[PDB]
Amino acid sequence: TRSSRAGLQFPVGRVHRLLRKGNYAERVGAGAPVYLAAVLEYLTAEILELAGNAARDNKKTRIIPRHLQLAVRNDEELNKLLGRVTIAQGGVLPNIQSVLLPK
Amino acid sequence: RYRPGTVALREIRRYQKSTELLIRKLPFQRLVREIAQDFKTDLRFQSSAVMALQEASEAYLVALFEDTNLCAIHAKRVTIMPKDIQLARRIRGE
Amino acid sequence: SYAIYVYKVLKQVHPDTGISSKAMSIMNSFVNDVFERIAGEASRLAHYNKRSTITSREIQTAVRLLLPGELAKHAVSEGTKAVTKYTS
Amino acid sequence: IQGITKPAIRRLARRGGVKRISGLIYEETRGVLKVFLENVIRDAVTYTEHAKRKTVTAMDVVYALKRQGRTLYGFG
């Protein structure tokens, strides 16, 4: 497969067609979906790594929306990437303004 | 004994650990229905479209309340007031 | 959709962890969102430069434009590494 | 619009970290929630009608939100 030939798990052929059928340019070179797939697979692994951590930190064996949201909002860079994104059923990061707590 | 601050903090802890939708579902549904049927009379929604709307609406209000809190604290108050909601919305661009 | 490939990556990173069905839909939106942001900017870059073809170069510069700092640094290294491995 | 009750509004303010709430907040929130809902529903209807359908789908709502810069994950 084109994916295994680039060392990826994400599907290079499928990224290629969506790039073509997607009104982006009149041609799409072969290296473009490989590079794009690698980046989507990398970003996926980042989220999943951190969210798995938030799951085990709450003694959970399964990742649910809450853990993705905790992973995203505790990591400075995923928080900027996803700053305008609502994760359904994610809740908020627990945090109380210090001025509201007994000194 | 009256401990409004202690009751407030406990509620903050409870609803910040929770992810459940906090507006009851049937009332939200009827509100979407009232607005939608005012745009077009024979319009229908999927139930998952109502829920999508509800997730987005609650997340919007929760974040607006966060900014509102900062506005109130800025004025050396812990009690949020309409001028706080309005300041947040103005600086937000709404 | 991307769920299968999300699951394959989950099993590399956390072999003993599962993912609920509504969390997989989150991940699927995430993938498509990121795809659309990069491809859109890639198309913008190609049009700015009067280029008819989107290459790995347009993907890379878009990753530099759209990813913060360290995420971009690693995304670029992963992508360049995948492309060179592909050409062999 | 009054079906969005004081306790529901209080709960959202709590999740937002708010410690105390003036009684005037409840009517203000209802106004804001209604403006938000009308703006998103108006756009979702425009997508639905464009497609010559008369049932708003979750996808239609997703596109309305994204049109307004409020990307929502979990509905496609």
């Binding site: - | 229905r33 929604f45 999927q46 139930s47 998952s48 829920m51 | 769920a3 699951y7 993912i19 | -």
Partner: peptide, 22 residues
């Protein structure tokens, strides 16, 4: 019971948390 009322004629579900598995 805090759920949506599906018998509402305003709802049209004709076209449309478990473990995810392949």
């Amino acid at each position: 019971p805090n759920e949506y009322d599906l018998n509402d004629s305003f709802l049209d579900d004709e076209e449309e948390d478990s473990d995810w598995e392949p």
